[PDB]
Amino acid sequence: LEEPVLVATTDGVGTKTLLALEAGDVSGLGFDLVNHSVNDLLAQGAEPLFFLDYLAASHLDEGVLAALLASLAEACRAHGIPLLGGETAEMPGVYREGAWDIAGTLVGVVERSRILGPERVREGDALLALPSSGPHTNGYSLIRKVVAGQDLSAPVPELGESLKEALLRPHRAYLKEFRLLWEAGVELHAAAHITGGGLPENLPRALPPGLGAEVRRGSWPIPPVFPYLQRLGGIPEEEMYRVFNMGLGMVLVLPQEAAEEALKLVEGFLVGRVVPGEGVRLV
Amino acid sequence: EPVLVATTDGVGTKTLLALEAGDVSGLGFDLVNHSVNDLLAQGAEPLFFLDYLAASHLDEGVLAALLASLAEACRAHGIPLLGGETAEMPGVYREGAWDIAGTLVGVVERSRILGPERVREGDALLALPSSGPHTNGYSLIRKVVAGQDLSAPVPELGESLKEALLRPHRAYLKEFRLLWEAGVELHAAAHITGGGLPENLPRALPPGLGAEVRRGSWPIPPVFPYLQRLGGIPEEEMYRVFNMGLGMVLVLPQEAAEEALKLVEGFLVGRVVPGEGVRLV
């Protein structure tokens, strides 16, 4: 109460952008960026204050430029986040033909003593993961290679939809979740947004020295698009968890009792514990 | 309604020249400084900065140069380099290509507002000197110096093309602080970037008011005319693409302009007149 701290994060959609253009549908890229931006902030313990972006391409196609601006405006107002005037850059000398780079920045606020972080993490906390909606916005370079030459618009058995639909599903935002836990006074220690690098890289960040994580395999639902890509690209498991979120959209580190009170308010999965040592071992 | 102000900006292809010339030492200053000037023109005091760097490949060498640069730049203005992000996308960037982008957040206090509505006919135009092309016009620059020895000292410039062309975008924070602290009356300000004077100065002028600038009224950096010849560029084009020495232009009462020159380094380059656009007189 009365200790507001300005925080912020800056992100980019990533190579997923090339996948979207190819499939001729950037309608979701606006949510991919905003939602990814919202989560990097939720990991700190903050709420969004406003967003602004920097779009750069080989050639700012009037068509796709409008569809992008259209998308970002829908993603922000979807979260009640004020959208600020963003910029644009056209540099055919920097970008590959037809390429685009969608980046942005989200500013937020958090009460100092309620900032999430490794120093609040204690040994014995529960690892509560919030379900990802698919690949989200990391690892689409591996993806574009693996699906290179497939009929992205063709239905897939084991998916329940096509590659286009399953691979372009927007990055999922967990703002609604967090608010449910905040309004309920649920004790949260740390949190990790599982982006570039996967669970292995991102989780250890939310953990203090002398503390590693223990993740029980199969304790959470894995989007079907992952093992599919894996099989198609013959991608090893050790590499799957290093590139993809494997269904782990966000991992929460909090007291055991808190997870319980949380799973009654939010769609989550107890998937581990903070044990001595370091790094994240999959058990 | 947000109570703070913010702006995202990019360095432009100057990045490519710096990479090619083997020096990204000042790209952080270029980025941060461009952002700071954009907010000062609105009367905003800088609060914090965040950078976003992307590339075909994140050369460990360049990455540390840019990171160190950005930090010094931020340190110089006394603002925090809060967060940052890095991207490696060889499928998005041409080999060797990079893009330096970032976001600066600031805040406007009542005593420091600036806008087209405060500008009055008869106001003086006070120009703050640029350090060179700054961060606009490098598309033209690089094509004009192509084939040249960026390290071959030139007589006129008193240095090479690399030193004349890579000098960082100058930030005018210290100037605005002096002016703010002294309570000098200011109506509006224009940061001279893409499109030079003809495009940027009008953005700070109310409906039905234009500006007349005196040729030779302010110093024009040595590299500007040098390269105009090197590539036989028409004057009209120079002023359409480059700032020509006009780093930033303030529109303030004739009296406030006279006391301002006693506080900062600037020049009285013209006056606001009835009409539209900017015309060189």
> Helices A29-42 and A62-79 meet at what angle, rounded to 10?
40
Option in B16, B50, B97 nearest A105 (CB): B50
State whether A10 and B93 contact (CB < 8 Å).
Answer: no
What are the residue ranges of CATH 3.90.650.10 in chain B? 115-281
Option in A10, A11, A141 nearest B91 (CB): A141
**A-B C-beta contacts closer than 8 Å:** 120
How far apart (Å, rounded) are the C-alpha atoms in residues A51 and A81?
Answer: 7
Question: Comparing C-alpha atoms, which of B199, B280, B204, B273 is closest to residue B242?
Answer: B199
Reported as half-sphere exposure (CB side, CA atoms, 13 A), residue A82 has a value of 12
In what order do the strands lie in the sheet containing B188-191?
B188-191, B246-252, B124-129, B267-274, B209-213, B278-280
Reported as half-sphere exposure (CB side, CA atoms, 13 A), residue B133 has a value of 31
Per CB-CB distance under 8 Å, the chain A contacts of B191 are: none
What are the residue ranges of CATH 3.90.650.10 in chain A? 117-283
Option in B1, B54, B103 nearest A101 (CB): B54
Q: Which of A44, A96, A138 to mutate to test the interface with B (most CBs of B within 10 A)?
A: A96
Whole-number CA gyration radius for chain B: 19
Whole-number CA gyration radius for chain A: 19
What are the residue ranges of CATH 3.30.1330.10 in chain A? 3-116
Q: Which of B5, B94, B98, B142 to mutate to test the interface with A (most CBs of A within 10 A)?
A: B94
* CATH number of the structural domain A117-283: 3.90.650.10
**B261/A contact by beta carbon, under 8 A:** no
CATH top-level class of A3-116: alpha beta
DSSP labels for chain B? --SSEEEEEE-TTHHHHHHHTT--TTHHHHHHHHHHHHHHTTTEEEEEEEEEEEESS--HHHHHHHHHHHHHHHHHTT--EEEEEEEE-TTTBPTT-EEEEEEEEEEE-GGG---GGG--TT-EEEEEEPSSSTTS-HHHHHHHSTTS-TTS-BTTTTB-HHHHHHSPPPP-HHHHHHHHHTT----EEEE--TTHHHHHSGGGS-TTEEEEE-TTSS---THHHHHHHHTT--HHHHHHH--TTEEEEEEE-HHHHHHHTTTSS-EEEEEEEESSSEEE-
- In chain A, whose CA is at the least distance from the CA of B101? A54
- The answer to whether A31 and A170 have CB atoms below 8 angstroms apart is yes
Give the CATH H-level superfamily of domain B1-114. PurM-like, N-terminal domain (3.30.1330.10)
**B92/A contact by beta carbon, under 8 A:** yes
CATH top-level class of B115-281: alpha beta
How far apart (Å, rounded) are the C-alpha atoms in residues A203 and A181?
Answer: 20
How far apart (Å, rounded) are the C-alpha atoms in residues B242 and B133?
Answer: 6
State whether A87 and B7 contact (CB < 8 Å).
Answer: yes
Q: Which of B89, B93, B104, B139 to mutate to test the interface with A (most CBs of A within 10 A)?
A: B89
How far apart (Å, rounded) are the C-alpha atoms in residues B216 and A155?
Answer: 69
**B35/A contact by beta carbon, under 8 A:** no
State whether A14 and B89 contact (CB < 8 Å).
Answer: yes
- The answer to whether B193 and B134 have CB atoms below 8 angstroms apart is yes
What does the DSSP 8-state code read for residue A143?
H
- The answer to whether B61 and B22 have CB atoms below 8 angstroms apart is no
Roughly how many angstroms between the first and final C-alpha of chain B, as a whole number? 42
Give A180's contacts (C-beta < 8 A, 6+ positions apart): A265, A266
Per CB-CB distance under 8 Å, the chain B contacts of A195 are: none
- In chain B, whose CA is at the least distance from the CA of A140? B89
* Residue A97: exposure state from Cβ atoms within 10 A (0-12, 13-18, ≥19): exposed
State whether A84 and B9 contact (CB < 8 Å).
Answer: no
State whether A12 and B98 contact (CB < 8 Å).
Answer: no
- The answer to whether B22 and B163 have CB atoms below 8 angstroms apart is no
* Residue A151: exposure state from Cβ atoms within 10 A (0-12, 13-18, ≥19): exposed
**A104/B contact by beta carbon, under 8 A:** yes
DSSP labels for B82-113? EEEEEEE-TTTBPTT-EEEEEEEEEEE-GGG-
* Residue B202: exposure state from Cβ atoms within 10 A (0-12, 13-18, ≥19): middle
